[PDB]
Amino acid sequence: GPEEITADIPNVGEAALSKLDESGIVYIGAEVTGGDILVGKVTPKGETQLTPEEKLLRAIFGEKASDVKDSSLRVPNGVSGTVIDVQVFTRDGVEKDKRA
Amino acid sequence: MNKEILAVVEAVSNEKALPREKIFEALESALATATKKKYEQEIDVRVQIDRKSGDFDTFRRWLVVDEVTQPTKEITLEAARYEDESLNLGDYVEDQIESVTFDRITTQTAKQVIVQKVREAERAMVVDQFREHEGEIITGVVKKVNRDNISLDLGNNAEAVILREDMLPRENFRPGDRVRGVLYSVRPEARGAQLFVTRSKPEMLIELFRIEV
Amino acid sequence: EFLKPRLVDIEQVSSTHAKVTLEPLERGFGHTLGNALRRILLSSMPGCAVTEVEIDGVLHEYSTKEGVQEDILEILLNLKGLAVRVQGKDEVILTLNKSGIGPVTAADITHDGDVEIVKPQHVICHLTDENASISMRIKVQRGRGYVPASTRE
Amino acid sequence: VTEFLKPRLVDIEQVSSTHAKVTLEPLERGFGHTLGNALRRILLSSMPGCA
Amino acid sequence: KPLVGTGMERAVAVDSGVTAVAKRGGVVQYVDASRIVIKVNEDEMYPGEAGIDIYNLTKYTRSNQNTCINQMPCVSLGEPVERGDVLADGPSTDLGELAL
Amino acid sequence: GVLKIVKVYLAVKRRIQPGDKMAGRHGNKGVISKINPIEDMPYDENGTPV
Amino acid sequence: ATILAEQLEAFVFDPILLRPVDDLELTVRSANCLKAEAIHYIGDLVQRTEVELLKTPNLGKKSLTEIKDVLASRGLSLGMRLENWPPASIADE
C-alpha cells in the first residue's frame, strides 16, 4: 500500500510528538534541535519474524498480520534551526489532509 | 461480542492450569499500554473480568477511603452523601472507564507488550513451581560461567545459580559437568525465584550417603 | 607604612562616563591597581540587559509584521541595545504598546515601579500606517558577562 | 551575581627551602593573569628588606 | 560598507539584480518590510493606466549556496526618489553600495 | 509514484568560532585561532581595544 | 597578598496556595466552583477540608475530577487549617 504522513506513529511518545501538530508536519516557528522529527512518516517494516505472543494480537485489534515491525521515519542532527517555511505539494487525486 | 477471545481463551497449550482470565487482562492492558503517553496517568490492570465478553473494556476505579492519598482513586463519606451515603468505608467502588491504544502500528508494540505481560505471568508461574519444592537435593548441568557464580540447567526449562561463596575453594566447576546439592532460595529473589543451591552444607551429603546405601 | 588610596574626586563630565581619582599611591602601585581594576571592571560587572521578547503576531524571529518597516530580527537587535536599570528584582517583565505613524521610541514602555530607562530617545522600530500597531512583552534580567542564546523558549 | 568561583591553593610543590612552585585553581576566566600580574609586580618591585 | 572602496561598488550593486531599482521616479507613499509603494511624478507619467508602482520585495528565502537572500527597504516615507535609483538594499548591500 | 512532497526550511544562525576562515581583500587568509576576552586586547592611550 | 589587601581597605508559605485559584493550570470553571463560596486563593480552599467542599452542590461531576487533578500535585486540598490567612513565612515582611 501507500505510505502515511499522519502523526499516529508507532515507537514514539509525547516527547517527540509534542513538536508536531495533529497531522505530522512540524509547526512554522518550532525551534528544533539536531535529531528531532519534522515530518512523521511510517511504512518501513519490510518482513522480519513473529512468535506465539505476536499471533495473540491477531484477533483482538482487527489486524490479520499486524505488519511485523514499525519505526516512524525520524531524522539526524548536527544542526539546530528554526522552521520558517513549509511547502506541501500534492499529486492530484490524493486526499488533502488538514494541514494541506 | 465477536467471540474471537472466547476461542482464544481455550488455546490452551501452556496457560490451561495457569490463570486464563488474568492472562486476558494481561493481554488487554498490553493492547492498551504500547503507544499510550497522554491520558492522565497510564492504564489500569484492574478491569471488569466478564468471561462472556472476552474483550473486557479496561474500566477504571474510584476506591472509597477516608484519606487523601492516590488522587485518581479517592472517595470519602461526605462525597458518598451525593450518592445518598450508599458507599461504605474502604470499598473499591469503580466509577470510571478507559479505552485502547490502536492500530497497524501500536500493535506490534502491543505484541511486544503482550509478550512482556506473558513473560511476567511465566515468571510468576516459575516462582510457584520453585515454591512447590522449596529447596531439595536435586542435581543439574552447568551451561554458563559468570564472575563468582555458576549457572546450572535442570529439567522442565529450569535454571539454578550456584554461588562461589557456597562452593569449595580448590574444587572448581566448568560447563558440561553434573553437580547435585540442596537449594535454599525460592521465595524473594529477583523477578521470580532464582534457584540458589549450596553444595557445601552438611545436609548436602545427608542423603548423598543415603543415595548409595 | 604604605600610603593608602582614597577616592578624592568623581568628575561626572558627561552623563555616560566619569573620571574617578585615587590618591595617593607609592610608586609601582599606580600601574598595578590601574591594570587590576581595569581588568575587573571590563571582566565581570553586574549589568541589566534583556533576554526574551514576545511580539504578539510573530511566530518566529525571521518573520515580518504587517506595518513596521524593519524586520523582527532588526527589532530584536534594537532591543538588545536597550540600556535599562532595575532596582529591587532578579528579573522583570516590561510591557510595550504603541499605535500610530512614527517611531516607537524607548520611552513608550509602560514602566514599572522600579525599572528606569536611562536613555529614552532610543529608537526601536518605525510604525508606518494609521492602524498598524505592535504590542510586545520584554524580559529584562540581571547577569554577568556574555550569556549567548546557544548555551541556554 | 557576586559569588564567583573562589580558589584555594591545591599544592605547594617545592624544591629546597628557598624555592617553590605554588599553583592556584580554579580561577574565573581572565583572573589568572590579573592575580599573577598583581603578585608579580608587588613582589618584584616593592618588598621590605635589607641589603 | 567599505571605508576604503574604489567607487565601483555602485555599478556592481545596481547593475546586478539584487537591489530594487526604481523604474519611474516620484514620491514614496507606503514603506513596509514586505512592500514599497512609489507614487509616480506627473512629469514621468502615462496619460492612461493611472499608475502608482508596487515593489514586492523578496524576504527570507534560500539561495543556491544556502545563504539568506534578503531585501531590506532603505527609504523613508514621503521621500523623493529619482529614476534609476535604489529603493531596497539586497544581500551584502547598503544604500546602494556593495558591502561584502 | 509519489503522493505528496513536504519541504521544510530550517534557518540556522551560524555566528563565528575558532576554525572559520576570514580574509581581507589582498590575499591575507587565515583560520581564526583564538577568540580572546575584551581585556587581553592591546589598547592605546585613549582606552579603545583593538 | 597582605600588602595588596591593605591597599584596598579604603574601598570595600505555600506559594501556589497564596496564589489565586484562577492562577491554577486547569480551566477557570474548576476555580469558579471554589469562587462560588467567594474563594479566590487556593490557601482558603485548603482552609476547609475537601469533604467540606463536597458538602456543596456548587461542585459538579467534572469539578471533583478537577479537584483531584489539582490536588495530585501536592500543592492544594490536602486538608489544611490555618488561623485565618497567614502561617509563619506568610509574615508581614
Curated annotation (Swiss-Prot), chain E:
Biological role stated in the UniProt entry: DNA-dependent RNA polymerase catalyzes the transcription of DNA into RNA using the four ribonucleoside triphosphates as substrates.
Similarity section: Belongs to the RNA polymerase beta chain family.
Gene: rpoB
Subunit structure: The RNAP catalytic core consists of 2 alpha, 1 beta, 1 beta' and 1 omega subunit. When a sigma factor is associated with the core the holoenzyme is formed, which can initiate transcription.
Protein name: DNA-directed RNA polymerase subunit beta
Part of the full-length chain shown: 697 to 796 of 1342
Organism: Escherichia coli O157:H7
Superkingdom of source: Bacteria
